A = this chain, B = another copy of it.
Amino acid sequence: SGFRKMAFPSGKVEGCMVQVTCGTTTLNGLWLDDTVYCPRHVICTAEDMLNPNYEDLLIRKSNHSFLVQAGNVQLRVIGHSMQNCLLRLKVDTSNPKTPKYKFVRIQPGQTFSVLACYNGSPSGVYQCAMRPNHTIKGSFLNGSCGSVGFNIDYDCVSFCYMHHMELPTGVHAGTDLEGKFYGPFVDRQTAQAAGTDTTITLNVLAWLYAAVINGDRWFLNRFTTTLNDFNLVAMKYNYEPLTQDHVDILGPLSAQTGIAVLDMCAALKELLQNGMNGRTILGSTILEDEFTPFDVVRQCSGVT
């Protein structure tokens, strides 16, 4: 009993964080080997952000326009270029703390840790999920842009996110580490169409499984359902449709707990219709959707 959102330890990412400055704008950069990656809107002033022409703004810049600082040490920029919505700044020093890493583009519903930074200074870490509408529900203030999300896999840090914007509903939009936006968003300050978020059904089921592994079973029932009959109900409540490929992903948890996926679907179906009537599941009311099947497996078996 007892289960909560955990982030990955952030030591390896913190040794990569730098401050990038252009004009009077400062934000955060990622220093790996001899490149710093950062949002290309570092080259925007006030007047630029409504409708920036980035190739225009960039041709007006030199290596020397960028001041990069790591700790108290200035790094010299000896090359710059733009990749989608990112700048790649080549520096004179290759980072001694660079970890094994890779860049990956993640999918809706997957989770990752975010190291939130201000002026290249790591300030907090938390865990969140890529929402079905390609936003993230983070916690960020002015100066956070350039913060990164990642996962750790054995020894290797997979970077999957770099923060760029806060939408007016309070959620956040950013890019992968090739600078491609998650979602239909652009790095201009103009109203943009977002899209109703939905509940990550696959994660809610993972989390019900986690409850069963930790001893909470009160919500189980001896019904079952069809995938299709489940989706009829779920879709009414703004849950994502459950695909057979989602069912296959839950196979391992099902095997381990002895509760068939469709039988767990039957449990969620009743939860959605009736609620919890006062009870909790892992200390929550509310069905939690930001733990993946892998999160649940990692955290119920404590992989380091």
Contacts and interface: CB of A to CB of B under 8 A. Distances in A.
Contact of A9 (B124, B166, B302): B124
Binding site secondary structure of chain A: loop
Contacts of A143: 302
Nearest to A124: B6
Given A139-B299, A303-B123, A11 B10 contact: yes
A258 B47 CA distance: 33
B124 A8 contact: yes
A7 interface: yes
B304 A6 contact: no
A7 B126 contact: yes
Nearest to A142: B302
A35 interface: no
Given A285-B285, A304-B122, A138 B15 contact: no
A123 B11 contact: no
A122 B9 CA distance: 7
**Which among A124, A171, A302, A303 has the greatest number of chain B C-beta atoms within 10 A?**
A124
A285 B278 CA distance: 13
A259 B116 CA distance: 29
Interface in A163-202: 166, 169-172
**Which among A9, A12, A304 has the greatest number of chain B C-beta atoms within 10 A?**
A9
A232 interface: no
A141 B302 contact: yes
- CB-CB nearest 3 A-B residue pairs: A1-B170, A6-B124, A11-B11
Given A2-B171, A11-B14, A119-B304, 11 more contacts: A1-B169, A2-B139, A4-B128, A6-B126, A7-B124, A8-B124, A9-B122, A9-B124, A9-B125, A10-B11, A170-B215
